[PDB]
Amino acid sequence: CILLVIAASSIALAAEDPVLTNSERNKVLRYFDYVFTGVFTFEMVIKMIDQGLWNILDFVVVVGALVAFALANALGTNKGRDIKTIKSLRVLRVLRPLKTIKRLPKLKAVFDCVVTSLKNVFNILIVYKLFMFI
Amino acid sequence: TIRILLWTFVQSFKALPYVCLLIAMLFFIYAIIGMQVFGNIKLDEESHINRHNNFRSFFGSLMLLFRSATGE
Amino acid sequence: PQVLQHSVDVTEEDRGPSRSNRMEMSIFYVVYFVVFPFFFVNIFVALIIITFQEQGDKMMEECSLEKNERAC
Amino acid sequence: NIVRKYAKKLIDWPPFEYMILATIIANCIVLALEQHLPEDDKTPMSRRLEKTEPYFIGIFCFEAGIKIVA
Amino acid sequence: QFDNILFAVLTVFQCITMEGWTTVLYNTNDALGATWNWLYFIPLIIIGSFFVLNLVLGVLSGEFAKERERVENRRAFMKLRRQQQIERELNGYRAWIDKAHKERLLRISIRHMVKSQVFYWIVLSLVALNTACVAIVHHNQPQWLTHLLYYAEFLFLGLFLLEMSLKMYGMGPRLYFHSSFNCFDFGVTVGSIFEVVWAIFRPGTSFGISVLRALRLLRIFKITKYWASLRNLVVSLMSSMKSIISLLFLLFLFIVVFALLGMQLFGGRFNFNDGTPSANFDTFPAAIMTVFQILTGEDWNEVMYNGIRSQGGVSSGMWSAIYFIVLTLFGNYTLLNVFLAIAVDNLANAQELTKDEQEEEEAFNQKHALRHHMSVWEQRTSQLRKH
Amino acid sequence: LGPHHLDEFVRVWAEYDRAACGRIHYTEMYEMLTLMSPPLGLGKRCPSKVAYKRLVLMNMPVAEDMTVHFTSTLMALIRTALDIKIAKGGADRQQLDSELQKETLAIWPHLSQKMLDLLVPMPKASDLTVGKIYAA
Amino acid sequence: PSMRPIILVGPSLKGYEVTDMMQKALFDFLKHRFDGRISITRVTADISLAEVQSEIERIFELARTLQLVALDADTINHPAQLSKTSLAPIIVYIKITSPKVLQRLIKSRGKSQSKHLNVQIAASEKLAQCPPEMFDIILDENQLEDACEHLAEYLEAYWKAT
Ligand SMILES: CC(C)CCC[C@@H](C)[C@H]1CC[C@H]2[C@@H]3CC=C4C[C@@H](OC(=O)CCC(=O)O)CC[C@]4(C)[C@H]3CC[C@]12C
Ligand SMILES: CC(C)CCC[C@@H](C)[C@H]1CC[C@H]2[C@@H]3CC=C4C[C@@H](OC(=O)CCC(=O)O)CC[C@]4(C)[C@H]3CC[C@]12C
Ligand SMILES: CC(C)CCC[C@@H](C)[C@H]1CC[C@H]2[C@@H]3CC=C4C[C@@H](OC(=O)CCC(=O)O)CC[C@]4(C)[C@H]3CC[C@]12C
Ligand SMILES: CC(C)CCC[C@@H](C)[C@H]1CC[C@H]2[C@@H]3CC=C4C[C@@H](OC(=O)CCC(=O)O)CC[C@]4(C)[C@H]3CC[C@]12C
Ligand SMILES: CCCCCCCCCCCCCCCC
Ligand SMILES: CCCCCCCCCCCCCCCC
Ligand SMILES: [Ca+2]
């Protein structure tokens, strides 16, 4: 059920209109953003109550959403150049497609194959970075 | 011999359904990024953010990343 | 090539270009290519080919006797 | 045609095949120095280097003759 | 344009080489409509260019593994694995030679200090400043830097000459060139002096070969378990060096002939009314470096449009697309073949050389002094060895 | 020998099965091997006795009809060519055949015991095996 | 005797810088590790000929003090060449396991030895063909630590036994 909220919120990113900020489509999608982040927090809190204190990436996304929805809805003004603040805190929402890497035990096994292959070419990616420096 | 090369190499594209999904998720992430960050640049035909090439849409930015991935 | 052209068409510090001057500065760009795009990048492609492990092989010593040619 | 006593196979001695490898590298430098000007025009240097072609043919034609004999 | 069949198997060969495949795509979006054209060009770049690298990399990689196990190629590797054994055990046998007025009073304590473990970490903490002194020279740098870093050569040139003496007059002139990077140290200490003299006689271009001393920071790898993997690469690259040099020289005799042949066809013919392009074929230095554009394949396109309108136009003169096709097809896949054979032969050797150290020095003697995670390449090249 | 050199067996069967004689008569067991080339077929150039006794080492069983099984015939060609658990002779050959059966289950348990015994015939010695037919 | 004497052999002829330094480094290890338990003696008389016998009891009377002694001989370079004497030493073998490393080693040790490479190689071959059991210990190890620990542990076993 979570994994479908992950894959339905990530398409709410691909439908937003970059130019028409307050189009009618973006007004609906900013009602979905509360719905999707509401699910993630009440998937985090129960997870952090039942596990104790990748999960950092989940933690950042839910906070970045709340902070964005807080300081924009609370005042939104009276601070120096804070329209760019939410516009740069909503780019954290791009990490929602990254929450599915660990939810799928077979996708995670491919991500760990890229990482394990980035460590084989790492004593040559330092010789490469040193010759490229000379 | 042309069909076994094709057969052998397309069968092994069927044994890796998830390797061509981390790549399709790289093209997803960047695309989104390019949207919010690079999406409202004004199109100028002198520059390379044209009417052809831009970040104004998901598919218009997925083509920009494919045009860029292929080294163009 | 547009960086080779500017690197050849070079005169002095804080002076505009002069075409085909310093044509020996194209040796910096053939020694760069023979090293990084040709040699070093093909070291990356070959350290991944050479050091690539089967995805999952934990089936009784990977089918103790019957292996790649034997099993298939 | 097949007449023996060539006295030519004896000529393929190592002092003899490092002067062909010397006239070839010399030839490859003459071709490297030529500059091509658009419409029948020729630089003064490229008119000088055109005077070496009978020599380079003279040596390369010697080798074919001495080899088709030996 | 795909007017003809010959005009279409060249517009589609251009797109597979991935040169200017978007101007072709953007023309047929304007001309026709941008809804369906992507079904022609993305399936054409993916199949024609990406899916042919997969096949060419695969077909080559399997061919390089079948040739590594030829009888003539094992025989010449075991002859390399052997001299690595001799050099490895001889190092220990030269470690036992541990001998315990100024002829024997300074030359005894010098070579004591100048080989100590606190000495290395001084020079390599002092060649990590010489490679950050010449890493901050930007344009319009403040006038205090230009003078400060001007002494920074002489402080470092003089000091690195000081340690070039202690390795010469404290360990021996003849017994000075037995190590590899110790010969490298001489290579740039004289090289750095050459820049100093050459810059007084001709201020200006200062290509500055004293950052080549940064290559000694590679010896920080000695303190890691990644030295055997990396030294065996250079040991294998140095053994097969008369076959890399005489292979870069056949990739240069086919750049020359071609450059030559490119002058005969387009020499002097690039004087267009707009101006002759920078990618000429008129002189040899300019004919070499445009065959080097076509081989590396980037904008072989534009050099072909000039070479077609050179000999006519889209007309009796478009027979000259054969030069720019044969040369960007046999240099796209002949450089990959040559430079991947160099990087697979010399890198699968540095993988067995570093494996017959652990499997002797930690398995053979550790016992007689008293698969297992094999990659797909290692397993398949052992079944090919056992036939 | 690999899956490349084994589809030949599928092919060469067709020109003399003609959709009918899957119980193919055993005369072709020599004819088929000469037609094919190594490493699957014996070959038509050098059928020498030491070369051919590999077929005797390949002790294929025969039924009452002097006939062989396509599945059984295919494996024995594999097993000798790849030297998979091949012994010199005697019951030690069948001692490894117990593993030959057993190894298959842990890989492919979907095979029954008949097709296991089809893949591993374990021929009984008194019967004139195909190698024994031509050795006599 | 009370303690079996220690005598080293095996690289090449003694007197040559190679074997000389090999043995002297090993004896420096013996000294500075076992300082205060072994006395080092230098021998200039041919032990195989047993002034020749004048030093044998001198070796005995340092061997008759419940303490080990290292014998810096200068004329014995073979196991069979000392199969006759009653000294019954412990024959530790500094083994070289390849001719090629041997020629490289001698060549690298200046040029005065370079004119004597052939004779040292011949004597090393002669030593190699000697049977292995004629040597009490085998030291073919490359690193100083390995052979030092090997000899130290064997001497420790002997010392704990006696
Ligand atoms: C294609 C589907 C199966 C992908 C999976 C996700 C969908 C189940 C949902 C999740 C959120 C949905 C979006 C939520 C809100 C809207 C606004 C909705 O109304 C408008 O903005 C239209 C206004 C106009 O007519 O101009 C249009 C569809 C859209 C983008 C939805 C499209 C379908 C989405 C992506
Ligand atoms: C190895 C493969 C299986 C991995 C997954 C696919 C990816 C390689 C990505 C990278 C480039 C992507 C393409 C980039 C651009 C486009 C055009 C896009 O076009 C439109 O929707 C409308 C036309 C327009 O692009 O303007 C459709 C998706 C597509 C084909 C994308 C499909 C998915 C692709 C092939
Ligand atoms: C081990 C690796 C990292 C070393 C890489 C450095 C060399 C292999 C290459 C890189 C740049 C090259 C240089 C780039 C440019 C020049 C200048 C050229 O002459 C000039 O143009 C200098 C005077 C002027 O500009 O008029 C002579 C060759 C040289 C030194 C090249 C020689 C070979 C160099 C040093
Ligand atoms: C220890 C080694 C491996 C790394 C040393 C650091 C350098 C690779 C980089 C890091 C930050 C760089 C600086 C970042 C910013 C600037 C400002 C910029 O110059 C100006 O401000 C313009 C006016 C002028 O000073 O001429 C470019 C140079 C400089 C000093 C750069 C010089 C090179 C630096 C020191
Ligand atoms: C065009 C006027 C004369 C220019 C002379 C330049 C000399 C150096 C040429 C360097 C480019 C050719 C490199 C050859 C090896 C790839
Ligand atoms: C004994 C030398 C050890 C060196 C350890 C680091 C080596 C790193 C690889 C160097 C490869 C240089 C390639 C240069 C271009 C052909
Ligand atoms: Ca390109």
Q: DSSP readout, E197-219?
A: HHHHSS-S----TTGGGGGGGGG
Distance, in Å, from the CA atom of G83 to the CA atom of G7, rounded to the nearest integer, reads: 13
DSSP H helical segments within chain E, as ranges? Answer: 8-16, 21-31, 38-45, 51-68, 71-95, 102-113, 117-123, 130-133, 143-166, 180-200, 227-239, 245-248, 253-266, 284-295, 300-309, 323-329, 334-352, 355-361, 365-368, 376-383
**G93: helix, coil or strand?**
strand
Distance, in Å, from the CA atom of C52 to the CA atom of F41, rounded to the nearest integer, reads: 35
Indicate which residue's Cα is closest to atom 7 of ligand 5.
C24
Distance, in Å, from the CA atom of E56 to the CA atom of B24, rounded to the nearest integer, reads: 23
Both tokens assigned to D66:
């001495």
B62 has a chain E CB within 8 A of its CB: no
**F23: helix, coil or strand?**
coil
Residue B68 CB partners (closer than 8 Å, separation 6+): none
Q: Which residue has the tokens 């690595």?
A: E84
Q: Are E334 and E294 in contact (CB under 8 A)?
A: no
What strands lie across the sheet with G137-139, from one edge to the other? G38-42, G68-72, G6-9, G90-94, G137-139
Chain A contacts of C35, Cβ < 8 Å? 131
Sequence letter at residue D37? L
Which chain C residue has the Cα nearest residue F84? C70
Q: How far is CA E85 from CA D45, E2, E356, in A?
A: 58, 63, 9
Both tokens assigned to E305:
């449009």
Residue F135 neighbours by CB distance under 10 Å:
14
Alpha carbon E317 to chain centroid, angstroms: 39
| Residue G137, H or E segment | strand G137-139
Q: Looking at beta carbons, which pairs linking E34-39 to residues 24 or more positions away fall under 8 Å?
A: E38/B63
User: Does C25 sit in the ligand 3 pocket, CB within 6 Å?
Assistant: yes
Q: Which residue has the tokens 């060549």?
A: G107
Phi, psi of G6 (to 5 degrees): -105, 125
Burial tier of E118 (Cβ tally within 10 Å: 0-12, 13-18, 19+): exposed
Q: Among B72, B69, B65, B66, which Cα is nearest to B38's?
A: B65
Q: Among E346, E353, E352, E345, which Cα is nearest to E84's?
A: E353
* DSSP-derived secondary structure letter, E96: S
Sequence letter at residue E52? V
In Å, how far is C47's CA from the nearest CA of chain E?
A: 7
Residue G59 neighbours by CB distance under 10 Å:
18
Which chain C residue has the Cα nearest residue A131? C36
Q: Are G158 and G1 in contact (CB under 8 A)?
A: no
Both tokens assigned to E150:
């001007």
Distance, in Å, from the CA atom of G148 to the CA atom of G155, rounded to the nearest integer, reads: 10
Q: Are E256 and E373 in contact (CB under 8 A)?
A: no
**G72: helix, coil or strand?**
strand
Apex CA E145: angle with CA E142 and CA E149, to 5°? Answer: 155
**G92: helix, coil or strand?**
strand
Distance, in Å, from the CA atom of E69 to the CA atom of G154, rounded to the nearest integer, reads: 45
Both tokens assigned to C11:
């005169």
Distance, in Å, from the CA atom of E343 to the CA atom of E323, rounded to the nearest integer, reads: 29
Phi, psi of G84 (to 5 degrees): -105, -35
Q: In chain A, which among 114-133 make CB contacts under 8 A with chain C?
A: 116-117, 120-121, 124-125, 128, 131-132
Touching partners of E (3+ C-beta pairs < 8 Å): A, B, C, D, G
Q: How far is CA E238 from CA E70, E180, E187, in A?
A: 21, 11, 17
Chain-chain contact of D36 with E281 (C-beta, under 8 angstroms) = yes
Q: Which residue has the tokens 């037919």?
A: F133
Nearest by CB to residue A134, choosing from E211, E226, E230, is E211
**Resolution expressed in Å:** 3.1
- Check the CA dihedral A38-A42-A43-A44 and report its sign: positive
Q: In chain A, which among 106-125 make CB contacts under 8 A with chain E?
A: 123
Q: Among E6, E67, E13, E20, which Cα is nearest to E344's?
A: E67
Q: Best mutation site among E192, E215, E347 for testing chain A: the one with the most A CBs within 10 Å?
A: E215
| Residue G91, H or E segment | strand G90-94
Phi, psi of E304 (to 5 degrees): -85, -35
**G50: helix, coil or strand?**
coil
Phi, psi of A59 (to 5 degrees): -65, -40
Distance, in Å, from the CA atom of E279 to the CA atom of E290, rounded to the nearest integer, reads: 6
Both tokens assigned to E252:
């240069």
Q: Which atom of ligand 3 is nearest to the CA of A131?
A: 3
Q: Which residues of F are annotated as a binding site for Ca(2+)?
A: 17, 23, 28
Chain A contacts of E217, Cβ < 8 Å? 130
Alpha carbon E106 to chain centroid, angstroms: 43
User: Does A130 sit in the ligand 3 pocket, CB within 6 Å?
Assistant: no
**E333: helix, coil or strand?**
coil
Distance, in Å, from the CA atom of D24 to the CA atom of D17, rounded to the nearest integer, reads: 11
Q: How far is CA E202 from CA E57, E195, E198, E206, in A?
A: 49, 10, 6, 9
Chain A contacts of E212, Cβ < 8 Å? 134
Q: Among A117, A116, A98, which Cα is nearest to A107's?
A: A98
Chain-chain contact of C50 with E380 (C-beta, under 8 angstroms) = no
| Residue G8, H or E segment | strand G6-9
Phi, psi of B70 (to 5 degrees): -75, 10
Q: How far is CA D29 from CA D24, E163, E256, E260, E352, in A?
A: 9, 44, 11, 11, 44
Chain-chain contact of E284 with D39 (C-beta, under 8 angstroms) = no
Residue E196 CB partners (closer than 8 Å, separation 6+): E153, E154, E157
Both tokens assigned to E322:
């054969």
Q: Are G69 and G62 in contact (CB under 8 A)?
A: yes
- Check the CA dihedral G22-G23-G27-G28 and report its sign: negative
Chain F contacts of C66, Cβ < 8 Å? 84, 103, 107
Apex CA E344: angle with CA E339 and CA E350, to 5°? Answer: 130
Q: Are E20 and E301 in contact (CB under 8 A)?
A: yes
Q: How far is CA D15 from CA C29, D23, D61, D63, G90, in A?
A: 39, 13, 18, 14, 65
Phi, psi of B61 (to 5 degrees): -95, -25
Q: Do chains A and G touch (3 or more CB pairs under 8 A)?
A: no
User: Does B53 sit in the ligand 2 pocket, CB within 6 Å?
Assistant: no
Distance, in Å, from the CA atom of B30 to the CA atom of E150, rounded to the nearest integer, reads: 45
Q: Give the binding-site residues of ligand 5, using a 6 Å CB cut-off.
A: C 20, 23-24, 26-27, 30; E 283, 285-286, 288-289
In Å, how far is F84's CA from the nearest CA of chain C?
A: 8
Phi, psi of G69 (to 5 degrees): -130, 135
Apex CA E195: angle with CA E192 and CA E200, to 5°? Answer: 140
Both tokens assigned to A54:
């990748």
With the most atoms of ligand 5 within 8 angstroms of its CB, the residue from E249, E255, E283, E296 to mutate is E283
Distance, in Å, from the CA atom of A129 to the CA atom of A123, rounded to the nearest integer, reads: 10
Both tokens assigned to D70:
């030996």
Residue E339 CB partners (closer than 8 Å, separation 6+): C38, C39, C42
B72 has a chain E CB within 8 A of its CB: yes
Q: Which atom of ligand 4 is nearest to the CA of E142?
A: 25
Distance, in Å, from the CA atom of B53 to the CA atom of B63, rounded to the nearest integer, reads: 8
Both tokens assigned to E127:
């060649």
Nearest by CB to residue E267, choosing from D32, D33, D36, is D36
Burial tier of G6 (Cβ tally within 10 Å: 0-12, 13-18, 19+): buried
Distance, in Å, from the CA atom of A113 to the CA atom of B18, rounded to the nearest integer, reads: 11
Distance, in Å, from the CA atom of A39 to the CA atom of A36, rounded to the nearest integer, reads: 5
Q: Report the phi/psi class of residue E276: left, alpha or beta, with left for phi > 0 and alpha for psi in -120 to 50.
A: beta
Both tokens assigned to C72:
């298939």
Burial tier of E61 (Cβ tally within 10 Å: 0-12, 13-18, 19+): middle
Q: Are E134 and E210 in contact (CB under 8 A)?
A: yes
In Å, how far is E271's CA from the nearest CA of chain D?
A: 7
Burial tier of E105 (Cβ tally within 10 Å: 0-12, 13-18, 19+): exposed
Residue A17 CB partners (closer than 8 Å, separation 6+): A23, A25, A26
Q: Are A39 and A65 in contact (CB under 8 A)?
A: no
Cα radius of gyration rounded to whole Å, chain A: 19
Residue E314 CB partners (closer than 8 Å, separation 6+): E308
* DSSP-derived secondary structure letter, G90: E
Q: Are G60 and G86 in contact (CB under 8 A)?
A: no
Q: Are C1 and E278 in contact (CB under 8 A)?
A: yes
Distance, in Å, from the CA atom of A52 to the CA atom of A49, rounded to the nearest integer, reads: 6
- Check the CA dihedral D30-D31-D34-D39 and report its sign: positive
| Residue D66, H or E segment | helix D53-69
**G69: helix, coil or strand?**
strand
Indicate which residue's Cα is closest to atom 9 of ligand 1.
A8
| Residue G70, H or E segment | strand G68-72
Q: Do chains E and C touch (3 or more CB pairs under 8 A)?
A: yes
Q: Among E111, E219, E128, E210, which Cα is nearest to E165's?
A: E111
**D8: helix, coil or strand?**
coil
Distance, in Å, from the CA atom of F47 to the CA atom of G6, rounded to the nearest integer, reads: 69
Nearest by CB to residue A124, choosing from C35, C36, C43, is C43
Distance, in Å, from the CA atom of E74 to the CA atom of E67, rounded to the nearest integer, reads: 9
Query: How far does the centroid of ligand 1 lie from the alpha carbon of residue A38, in Å?
Result: 19
Q: How far is CA E196 from CA E201, E210, G9, in A?
A: 9, 10, 56
B49 has a chain E CB within 8 A of its CB: no
* DSSP-derived secondary structure letter, G88: -
How many residues would you count in chain C? 72
User: Does C24 sit in the ligand 3 pocket, CB within 6 Å?
Assistant: yes
At what angle are helices E143-166 and E180-200 packed, to 10 degrees? 140
Distance, in Å, from the CA atom of G134 to the CA atom of G137, rounded to the nearest integer, reads: 9
User: Does C22 sit in the ligand 3 pocket, CB within 6 Å?
Assistant: yes
Q: Please, what's the b/e burial string for A5-19 (b: 16 or more CB within 10 A of its CB; e: otherwise)?
A: bbeebbebbbebbbe
Q: How far is CA E163 from CA D37, E104, E131, E216, G9, in A?
A: 56, 19, 17, 14, 40
Q: Are E313 and E272 in contact (CB under 8 A)?
A: no
Distance, in Å, from the CA atom of E222 to the CA atom of E179, rounded to the nearest integer, reads: 15
